[PDB]
Design a protein around this ligand. Structure first.
Ligand SMILES: *[C@@H]1O[C@H](CO)[C@@H](O[C@@H]2O[C@H](CO)[C@@H](O)[C@H](O)[C@H]2NC(C)=O)[C@H](O)[C@H]1NC(C)=O
Ligand SMILES: *[C@@H]1O[C@H](CO)[C@@H](O)[C@H](O)[C@H]1NC(C)=O
Ligand SMILES: *[C@@H]1O[C@H](CO)[C@@H](O)[C@H](O)[C@H]1NC(C)=O
Ligand SMILES: *[C@@H]1O[C@H](CO)[C@@H](O)[C@H](O)[C@H]1NC(C)=O
Lengths: 271, 228, 106, 230
């Protein structure tokens, strides 16, 4: 289901330290992914004022930034296709949540793009009968953003493969960030445990060096694990489908692409 | 019998906008018939007390005894004396409260330093520091507002005052407010409020913006030649 | 089709060229030499030694770099300058990194 | 008899290359019968102290200790307690301090903040601070210089590190340098050198002066010669 050509013509790694809205009142322990930190989506008052004079400029501006973000993601994750596709999916759901105004980021863009979209739809769709609120606008036009950002992805290296969103936007931003963190942690844990079993479980200086590296990585990721786990515990009673599952078993079972097993995640984190 | 009557700090004075005197008993078994009161000059006795808890894990009677009294009474040296009448000691436990008059009174110099250029180039966050220097009582309160609206207390953190190396009498303190980098690029104005006794108005506000440390002059000179 | 003639990494010159093509006719194509120089605006005479003051002069000889000091830092090679660090009465002579994330050990 | 033990900072680990452990004891009288033998996690004591301090302004005595342990052992994380057997103590007391396992290694984001223009306008003095944020563990050591030779310790003051409100896993610290205004005029190179575990070369440096940190003007001369090339 690759998009048509004419619309295509028309259109660090530090998890901590990011800004979250009301960090202590709620969302205690959530970590912003570096991809979301380096997201190519910046909406200012000047851009909104310049794109509100003529019909269709704001939506096309959003599509242009989505395409730029997709191109940046594809140029970053060029080695693996699955990781690049999942980064595209995560960024698409992130920008959808930002459009819907459910973003927890403290940036003015997250708290202001919903107001900008409300104002644009109000000043231009008085009698057009199209939905004027951000939520229904995203609901009806989620396919257009997908096709535009897939065009932006395809311009990077002329990739024939195409993928659908596949029910990604309705997941809350915390759960998606948690899934991304779990995927990264599980991949790095598989690599580190494979190397450790190769070099230390069949010389001593190599074993000591890899042990120090593993201890440092584990010390960082255990604090990250505890923060995300307590955040999940504060924010799991709302949904009954995820209320009865521990974070580790939720990553193992309901996440198909996480590639997280008992030994990979639970036996090393939950002990 | 640890009746530690620590006077409330000036930051506490301008935080809750009320002067609550403290006379708390520590490490004592909880008993009854304890008639706490405050006695001042000329024999005035006005008091309201709450927060009484019978049970404590450390077996210490709370006896918090917080009463609202005007700031001018403290400014007049009313020598607020606690009069905890415990059962073991028939005489009331006298604990006076008064400002230590005689200390130096130097007004702080508030400087709102702009964020570093490299951190903004990293495009991760924007921490604006409020360097407060030169105050002798070392009782400073720092609060931040954006567009006249105070922020949440957890966004900004204030360090405890510590003595200045060059000036032994004066003290200095610092505080940082962390916001997004594009939030700084938006053009919002951040105000740093510094509360101190020595200030003529007891507070001082400084405003930071994008246009506070920008290069006022650019001296580019494009010279191109076709000869060696 | 843009061809890169020369590229001095620590000067950031990036001398390139391309032959723009008009409609087919007797030759009127415009030959162009395209350069992209990134001035630091904050570097010193030595980018490694902090003691030297800010440098105002910006010298760019094209022929000299087509075929020494420069202004722009490199991401591949390391810039290490000797720096004194003192704990107490005695001092120990220690190395440092002028720029971060450039050539950190892996 | 109250004993205070200061853990060895990483600056003593790196610069001195020998971890000396001491526990000064205040409110203790001068008896001069101190024998502090440091003990491992087991019951076997390893080393005794070398030198002690006797003179005190308040006519007191401090039982400071010293021991030489290999750096790998100190990084391993066993319990080190200074077993004081002074006759002044009515009963033996044990103070337990060790390297706390559970602290991350985050690369510090060292930045240098130039003094504000108002402080320069007051013409009295200028304060230069270093923005060292996002480092773990909490320990940190920073030293200021001026054109290469080190500055006196009494000129710069280091603030106690505090947890970062945005990220509890990281810590921040501040250190101001009070300089005269005539020093800032025709400003010399003021450097912020800080040492921490998470740095690549273990030492980083940031340099500020009048024309770099928030400059009033950008005086640049840009010459191009031989545009024809070869
Ligand atoms: C400024 O630049 C000069 C350029 O010569 C440098 O001086 C020597 O630089 C080489 C390059 O690595 C070093 O091996 C020498 O040790 C430097 N000389 C001295 C005396 O240190 C240096 O970077 C700067 N000049 C000085 C005097 O420090
Ligand atoms: C700007 O540069 C010119 C030479 O290019 C110089 O004469 C002038 O003094 C400079 N401006 C200032 C304020 O120094
Ligand atoms: C010069 O202009 C051409 C267009 O004719 C463009 O392709 C080229 O990139 C330009 N040079 C630079 C350095 O941008
Ligand atoms: C500014 O630059 C010009 C040209 O390089 C020079 O003549 C002048 O002395 C400089 N002024 C200052 C204050 O550096």
């Amino acid at each position: 289901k690759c998009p048509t050509e004419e619309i295509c013509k028309d259109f660090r790694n530090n998890w901590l330290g990011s800004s979250v809205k009301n960090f202590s009142s709620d969302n205690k322990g959530v970590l912003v992914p570096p991809r979301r930190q380096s997201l190519c989506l910046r909406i200012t008052l000047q851009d909104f004022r310049t794109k509100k004079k003529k019909e269709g400029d704001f939506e096309k501006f959003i599509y242009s930034y989505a395409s730029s973000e997709a191109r940046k993601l594809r140029t970053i994750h060029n080695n693996n296709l699955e990781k690049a596709h999942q980064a595209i999916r995560y960024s698409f759901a992130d920008i959808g949540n930002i459009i819907r105004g459910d973003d927890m980021m403290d940036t003015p863009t997250s708290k202001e793009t919903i107001t900008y979209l409300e104002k644009v739809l109000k000043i231009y769709n008085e009698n057009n009968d199209k939905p004027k609120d951000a939520k229904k606008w995203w609901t009806e036009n989620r396919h257009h953003v997908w096709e535009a950002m897939m065009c932006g992805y395809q311009s990077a290296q002329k990739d024939n493969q195409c993928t659908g969103y596949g029910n990604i936007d309705d997941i809350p931003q915390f759960l998606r960030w948690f899934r991304e963190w779990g995927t990264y942690v599980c991949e790095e844990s598989e690599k580190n445990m494979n190397t450790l079993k190769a070099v230390c479980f069949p010389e001593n200086e190599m074993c000591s060096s890899t042990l120090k590296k593993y201890e440092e990585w584990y010390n960082k990721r255990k604090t990250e694990w505890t923060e995300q786990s307590i955040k999940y515990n504060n924010d799991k009673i709302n949904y009954t489908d995820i209320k009865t599952l521990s974070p580790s078993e939720y990553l193992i079972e309901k996440c198909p692409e996480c590639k997280c097993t008992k030994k990979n995640l639970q036996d090393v984190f939950e002990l | 019998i640890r009746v530690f009557a620590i006077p409330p700090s000036f930051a506490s004075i301008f935080l809750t906008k009320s002067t609550k005197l403290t006379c708390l008993v520590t490490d004592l078994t909880t008993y009854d018939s304890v008639t706490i009161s405050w006695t001042r000059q000329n024999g005035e006795a006005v008091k309201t007390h709450t927060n009484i808890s019978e049970s404590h894990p450390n077996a210490t009677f709370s006896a918090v005894g917080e009463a609202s009294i005007c700031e001018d009474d403290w400014n007049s040296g009313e020598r607020f004396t606690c009069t905890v009448t415990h059962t073991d000691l028939p005489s009331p436990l006298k604990q006076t409260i008064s400002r230590p008059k005689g200390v130096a009174l130097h007004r702080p110099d508030v400087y709102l330093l702009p964020p570093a250029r490299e951190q903004l180039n990293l495009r991760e966050s924007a921490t604006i520091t409020c360097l407060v220097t030169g105050f002798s009582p070392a009782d400073v309160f720092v609060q931040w507002m954006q567009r006249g609206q105070p922020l949440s207390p957890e966004k900004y953190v204030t360090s405890a005052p510590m003595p200045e190396p060059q000036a032994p009498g004066r003290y200095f303190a610092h505080s940082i407010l962390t916001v997004s980098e594009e939030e700084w690029n938006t053009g919002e104005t951040y105000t740093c409020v510094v509360a101190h006794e020595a200030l003529p108005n007891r507070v001082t506000e400084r405003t930071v913006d994008k246009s506070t440390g920008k290069p006022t002059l650019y001296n580019v000179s494009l010279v191109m030649s076709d000869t060696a | 089709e843009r061809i890169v003639l020369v590229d001095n990494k620590c000067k950031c010159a990036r001398i390139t060229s391309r032959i723009i093509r008009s409609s087919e006719d007797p030759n009127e194509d415009i030959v162009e030499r395209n350069i992209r120089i990134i001035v630091p605006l904050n570097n010193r005479e030595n980018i490694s030694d902090p003691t030297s003051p800010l440098r105002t002069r910006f010298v760019y000889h094209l022929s000299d770099l087509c075929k020494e000091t420069c202004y722009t830092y490199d991401r591949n090679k390391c810039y290490t300058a000797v720096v004194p660090l003192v704990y107490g009465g005695e001092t120990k002579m220690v190395e440092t990194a002028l720029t971060p994330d450039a050539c950190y050990p892996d």
